[PDB]
Amino acid sequence: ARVREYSRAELVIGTLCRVRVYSKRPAAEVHAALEEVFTLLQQQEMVLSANRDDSALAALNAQAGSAPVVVDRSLYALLERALFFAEKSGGAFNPALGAVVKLWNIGFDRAAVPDPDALKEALTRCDFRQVHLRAGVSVGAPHTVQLAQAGMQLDLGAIAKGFLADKIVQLLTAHALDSALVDLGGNIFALGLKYGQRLEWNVGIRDPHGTGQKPALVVSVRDCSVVTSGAYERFFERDGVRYHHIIDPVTGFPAHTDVDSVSIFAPRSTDAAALATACFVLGYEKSCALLREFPGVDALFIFPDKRVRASAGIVDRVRVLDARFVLER
Numbered sequence: 001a002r003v004r005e006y007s008r009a010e011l012v013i014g015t016l017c018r019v020r021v022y023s024k025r026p027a028a029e030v031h032a033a034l035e036e037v038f039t040l041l042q043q044q045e046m047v048l049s050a051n052r053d054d055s056a057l058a059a060l061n062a063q064a065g066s067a068p069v070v071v072d073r074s075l076y077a078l079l080e081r082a083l084f085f086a087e088k089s090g091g092a093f094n095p096a097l098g099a100v101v102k103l104w105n106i107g108f109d110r111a112a113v114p115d116p117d118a119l120k121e122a123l124t125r126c127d128f129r130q131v132h133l134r135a136g137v138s139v140g141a142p143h144t145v146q147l148a149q150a151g152m153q154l155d156l157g158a159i160a161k162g163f164l165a166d167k168i169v170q171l172l173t174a175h176a177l178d179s180a181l182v183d184l185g186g187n188i189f190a191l192g193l194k195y196g197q198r199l200e201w202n203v204g205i206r207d208p209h210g211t212g213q214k215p216a217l218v219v220s221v222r223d224c225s226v227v228t229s230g231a232y233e234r235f236f237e238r239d240g241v242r243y244h245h246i247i248d249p250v251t252g253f254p255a256h257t258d259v260d261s262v263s264i265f266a267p268r269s270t271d272a273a274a275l276a277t278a279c280f281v282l283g284y285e286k287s288c289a290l291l292r293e294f295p296g297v298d299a300l301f302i303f304p305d306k307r308v309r310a311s312a313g314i315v316d317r318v319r320v321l322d323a324r325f326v327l328e329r
């Protein structure tokens with residue numbers, strides 16, 4: 001039986017999604033797995049999207065201020081995990097920020113900053129503590145979500161790709177695959193080892209102010225997600241000012257922070273995504289404080305002066321490719 005390398009890529013969930021596999025299984029088995037990966041990505045686009053009218057999430061948001069809504073266990077568990085990171089991060093990551101994000105999403109489309117009072121009003125409808133998850137304990141009992149605050153809206157944009165990367169890894173494993181690189185719009189999961197000999201996957205992290213083509217550094221990892229938050233992934237400009245996609249929930253404006261990017265290395269991409277978002281909002285010192293709560297996670301920060309700091313679990317695995325950057329040790 002020979003090793004073969006495969007990849008497949010499609011535009012889906014608003015972005016380029018690519019999966020690379022090494023396997024000695026029959027090629028028909030790998031093809032079947034990849035078929036299911038990309039079918040899943042189409043199906044979940046219709047469950048999780050905050051910017052479509054027909055999604056399960058859109059339906060949930062339509063019942064804000066009303067009765068509990070039944071959801072499948074997958075969505076329920078994702079919402080539980082999101083609320084866990086909201087609480088741990090003091091709301092720096094907030095999955096109920098839709099009232100504010102939607103004002104900014106139209107701003108992006110129109111290259112215009114939302115209004116002062118409107119934004120102030122929207123912030124009154126973002127209390128994630130008013131998202132009530134309840135699930136009975138008896139056989140077959142439903143899972144429910146209630147949005148208690150009138151006009152509050154869930155937005156899982158910061159974590160949807162991480163969730164889908166974890167679902168993809170679980171699907172690959174279900175198909176007896178153990179070597180893959182999952183890349184959903186830049187949210188990475190490195191499953192197992194690649195082949196050259198078996199070697200770690202070398203995950204690239206971009207120059208925050210670069211074109212994105214080439215990585216500024218790489219980190220060698222196994223069985224790890226790598227998710228990076230940076231202003232650069234999505235912004236608009238108006239009258240000399242850049243407004244990026246990661247909102248500070250205290251201000252209702254794009255976060256003003258002391259790092260250019262934060263990359264989180266975690267066993268679960270869902271977790272890495274939530275934590276990367278929180279850490280970008282919190283800034284470096286408070287991020288270090290939060291991350292001490294999660295010993296199984298590593299982090300790499302790129303500062304505006306091109307210094308790079310990485311935690312102990314990964315620092316020896318970092319290789320700088322763009323010599324303008326310096327890895328502090």
Ligand SMILES: Nc1ncnc2c1ncn2[C@@H]1O[C@H](CO)[C@@H](O)[C@H]1O
Pocket residue numbers: 092093094095097101155156157158159245246247248249277281
């Ligand atoms: N502080 C935040 N916490 C959670 N999600 C956010 C936050 N700011 C923006 N978002 C959402 O996550 C996306 C950025 O990853 C945004 O497009 C928006 O949907």
Ligand SMILES: [Mg+2]
Pocket residue numbers: 248255256257258281282283
């Ligand atoms: Mg700040």
